[PDB]
Amino acid sequence: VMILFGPGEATNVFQYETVTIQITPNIGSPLTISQYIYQPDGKVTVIG
């Protein structure tokens, strides 16, 4: 699953913040993903 940010959500980096993603298929329980994000530490960072 990959999320690409547009110019709205891209505007400044997530820091000291909780990000929640939820995937809700048409049958069965949704998957809810939550991370508190510290300052990102590389070009890619492991947040959760």
**At closest approach, how far in Å is the CB of 5 from another protein?**
14
Closest CB to another protein among 32 and 40? 40
CA distance 26 to 39: 35
- CA dihedral defined by 3, 48, 38, 22, rounded to 10 degrees? 50
Closest CB to another protein among 15 and 29? 15
In the range 1-48, which residues lie near another protein by CB under 8 A? 11-13, 15-16, 39
The residues binding another protein (CB under 8 A) are: 11-13, 15-16, 39
